[model samples]
Target: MSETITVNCPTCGKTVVWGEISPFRPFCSKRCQLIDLGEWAAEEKRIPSSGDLSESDDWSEEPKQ
Candidate 1:
């Protein structure tokens, strides 16, 4: 039995069983994986870059040397 709850596979809109937080997460297979990759490659999906802030949340006046 799967120890985790299932969620709809985002790519195919089908039921996919989940056992844990997947390394290839929310995707059921490589084909599904690539679909997501294509979205990012086309900029259809992205975490909006907040004006090039750093991980520590400091904004550099210009690109770091």
Candidate 2:
């Protein structure tokens, strides 16, 4: 038998089985998944920019010093 692992959904604090059965392993359901998507779409969830505040958004082409 395959070992089953449990994990908590990031959107909701629901217990989830980390197995092939679950389509959304991290999220509980589609609703939760979409909610996360919406948050990202709305720019609610974002990672802090490591570049300097004066740096422009088009810093991808410039190699880091």
Candidate 3:
């Protein structure tokens, strides 16, 4: 009974509805949502602000052995 919003599922390139019906907006289905999360299971692929932090905060080099 209202207007509809649309978005693409970032994992598989599918269109999805961005309404209350979506518990996982931008990801069409639960499987796709999970798949997308796994896609980021590799750390380097995540947001770049974390990369900036790595470059500036090299204190992790402390020897622990």
Candidate 4:
């Protein structure tokens, strides 16, 4: 039999088997997954971006006083 691969859960740092048995491969459980989702929903975490960092709808060039 082949050795099973393992990975750390992104939310709780728990060791998880990287296989079909683990529905939440990257997370230990649904709680951790939802916690992570909540953080993203609250804007606590952000994806990296490059180039102009302006507001999407704010096209004005006037500097804030």
Better of 1 and 3 by lDDT: 3
Residues 1-65 of candidate 2: C-alpha lDDT, one tens digit per residue = 16568888667678878766666666778777677655545343454554654444444635452
How high is the CA lDDT of each candidate model?
0.60, 0.63, 0.62, 0.60
Over 4 Å off, model 1: 20-26, 39-65
lDDT of 3 at 55: 46
- lDDT string, candidate 3, 17-58, tens digits: 776665665677777777786654534554444333234233
Full candidate order by TM-score, most accurate first: 3, 2, 4, 1
Q: For each candidate, C-alpha RMSD in Å?
A: 10.4, 10.1, 8.9, 8.8
TM-score of each: 0.40, 0.42, 0.43, 0.41
Model 4's number of clashes is 0
Where model 3 places Cα greater than 4 Å from the true spot, the runs are 1-3, 21-26, 39-65
The alpha-carbon lDDT assigned to residue 56 of candidate 3 equals 29
Q: Candidate order by lDDT, highest to lowest?
A: 2, 3, 4, 1
Query: Which candidate model has the greater lDDT, 1 or 2?
Result: 2
Question: Best by lDDT, which number?
Answer: 2
Q: Provide the clashing-pair count of each candidate structure.
A: 0, 0, 0, 0
Which is the winner by lDDT between candidate 2 and candidate 4? 2
For candidate 3, the per-residue lDDT at 36 reads 80
**The best candidate in terms of TM-score:** 3
Q: Report the lDDT tens digits of candidate 4 across residue range 1-65.
A: 14457887777778987766656566678778787765545343453442354533224534341
